[PDB]
Amino acid sequence: SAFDLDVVKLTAQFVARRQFLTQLMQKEYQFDFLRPQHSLFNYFTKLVEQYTKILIPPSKLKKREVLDQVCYRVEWRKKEEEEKEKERVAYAQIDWHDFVVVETV
Amino acid sequence: RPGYKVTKQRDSEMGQQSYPEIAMPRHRFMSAYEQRPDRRWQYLLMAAEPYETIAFKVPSREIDKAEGKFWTHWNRETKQFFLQFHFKMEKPPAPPSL
Amino acid sequence: DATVYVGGLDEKVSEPLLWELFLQAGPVVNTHMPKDRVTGQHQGYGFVEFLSEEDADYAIKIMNMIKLYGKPIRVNKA
Amino acid sequence: ETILEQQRRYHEEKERLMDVMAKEMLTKKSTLRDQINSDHRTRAMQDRYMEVSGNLRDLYDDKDGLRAEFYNRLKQIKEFHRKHPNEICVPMSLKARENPSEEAQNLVEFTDEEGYGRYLDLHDCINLKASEKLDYITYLSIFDQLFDIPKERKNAEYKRYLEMLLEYLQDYTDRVKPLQDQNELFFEKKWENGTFPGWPKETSSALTHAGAHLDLSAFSSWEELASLGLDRLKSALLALGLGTLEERAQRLFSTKSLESLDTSLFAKNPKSKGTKRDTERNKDIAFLEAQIYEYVEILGEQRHLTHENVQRKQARTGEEREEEEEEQISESESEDEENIPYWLYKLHGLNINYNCEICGNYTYRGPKAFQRHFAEWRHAHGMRCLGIPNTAHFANVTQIEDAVSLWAKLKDTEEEYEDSSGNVVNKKTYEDLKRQG
């Protein structure tokens, strides 16, 4: 898959700085991932974004703090399933023929 | 349209004072075709462990039988009927059904 | 694994159709199929010791395909 | 090489690591909590979570199971943070290529190993679930950092230093407990009520060794806290404060071991030949003393915990002390993550010593039994896996060697070419000359 990866990431590199690809398509079935139809397209939208991000702080990162951050990320069902199970059991296990009605609607 | 609503009340800490053993009420629609003579109508049976079962006759073929009320969330509990249209005020011991 | 436990059988089955039956797969070296004395009849569960363990693990894989008197036969390790 | 790709991969790896140590902090909040608590008493500003969270071992709603493992993961997270710091550092420091990417088109290879090998390179947990340690730190072992008597930070082993101390005081009037009583001295006592004269050689040497020990123990037991930060903090406290000792009566003490009336004479004494001499000779010792002081303060809970241990063990019996030691040992060497017919046997020929060589040099007690070995699962496994096929032929000899030559003992047509010389010629050869003809 090295080929696909490389072309995705390259067209993503250039696309990150969007007119060169739209010209390439008309100039030159290799870049079929450009259309949102081709599944890989999605991952493409990722890579570009990522590169777009590298362009953000092109600024140094001077990050205790890392720890605090990982904690906050951490911070950012089973029992229920169990109770439900119990309910299913009991519902399945009671006499629905022990009737004693009062009225009607 | 028109729908039915039932308000069932339970004991006031009178006898339930005497072990997390299944410690909500459950409802089911039963056909009268099976009884311990006559038949031909449905019953909205409601049951709780200690107390005795209760039934309500439903001559109308269909009432309040809604169409995708909530947005398809899947905790079946017991069945679509129970989650769809029941409430169990466990703090006051009041079971509402509609 | 050399031995297996076998459930769900009919007393017309005996130690012989087990002998013959499981050696169809691989030879039963030691057969045990209780005869109950009191009412003189079988409950239908079995224990089988083989030559070594490989016989019996293949036996776990293949083994529970047997059907005794139209009915299902339990085979598990022991 | 397009720097964009490199910087990208860097930010991505950093993300991966943060995510890993965050997953960890998630499964067992103690990892952070523990750490943070200690941090609290070193850098007072630090904000710490609600006590309830700490106790119930929960981060938001779910209370996690209480967990050697805590410490382990803390050291693992330590190396992770090291990697992260490195990457952060290096980081701080089109058609042309797409054409060359066409190189070697014909490779039948599946490539799913960039984010998976990294994600995997830094995740929890062997084949499936045996060792909590990540592939990143697979050769990380705490027992090479903590002794058994320290119990991964539970206690600090001071018996050794009690020995050295006996050697220092040149007597035996000093008991383990009286020695600990001495240690307790360590803001003013260790300075104004010294066990020995602070200008004694043996004493200063001892104090050095001990200080070093306490410090290494400190940072050893709290990997997660920035060591350099703490070091620098202490150093600056040493330089900026430590006429820090003031008395309303005697004035200002100097670690020259003399007091001074007023700050004035104190200052004009810090340039004198005496103080120059002393501060120039006893600097390292004074500083080490100070470190012993502050590090022992930061470890008050461990000091107390150990002293307690001492008194306990001391008040044990023999059996008690033994069983306790057993416990410490087990804790030390345990995985950080848990998953009549007498003449009858002679007559029948049994209970007589015999051996099969091919099977694990195994012993057999009977000749009928060994004769039954010839048809067996394991015996045939040794043969067949050895490359000697299982059949009767070999159902005699035991030694591995001879059956190899026996198995060697176990394991051409003429197609008439047209020149009448090919009557020696093989079938396949003449077919090859069919393809040639």
From Swiss-Prot, chain C:
Quote the subunit structure annotation. Answer: Component of the 17S U2 SnRNP complex, a ribonucleoprotein complex that contains small nuclear RNA (snRNA) U2 and a number of specific proteins. Part of the SF3B subcomplex of the 17S U2 SnRNP complex. SF3B associates with the splicing subcomplex SF3A and a 12S RNA unit to form the U2 small nuclear ribonucleoproteins complex (U2 snRNP). SF3B4 has been found in complex spliceosome 'B' and 'C' as well. Component of the minor (U12-type spliceosome) spliceosome. Found in a complex with PRMT9, SF3B2 and SF3B4.
Q: What is the lineage of its organism?
A: Eukaryota, Metazoa, Chordata, Craniata, Vertebrata
Q: Which residues form the RRM domain?
A: 2-78
Q: Which residues of the full protein are shown?
A: 12 to 89 of 424
Where Phosphotyrosine occurs, the residues are 45
Q: Please give the function described in this protein's UniProt entry.
A: Component of the 17S U2 SnRNP complex of the spliceosome, a large ribonucleoprotein complex that removes introns from transcribed pre-mRNAs. The 17S U2 SnRNP complex (1) directly participates in early spliceosome assembly and (2) mediates recognition of the intron branch site during pre-mRNA splicing by promoting the selection of the pre-mRNA branch-site adenosine, the nucleophile for the first step of splicing.
Q: Which disease is given in the protein's UniProt record? A: Acrofacial dysostosis 1, Nager type: A form of acrofacial dysostosis, a group of disorders which are characterized by malformation of the craniofacial skeleton and the limbs. The major facial features of AFD1 include downslanted palpebral fissures, midface retrusion, and micrognathia, the latter of which often requires the placement of a tracheostomy in early childhood. Limb defects typically involve the anterior (radial) elements of the upper limbs and manifest as small or absent thumbs, triphalangeal thumbs, radial hyoplasia or aplasia, and radioulnar synostosis.
Which locations, inside or outside the cell, does it occupy?
A: Nucleus
Q: Which family does it belong to?
A: Belongs to the SF3B4 family.
Q: Which organism does this record belong to?
A: Homo sapiens (Human)
Q: Provide the protein name.
A: Splicing factor 3B subunit 4
Q: Which domain of life is it from?
A: Eukaryota
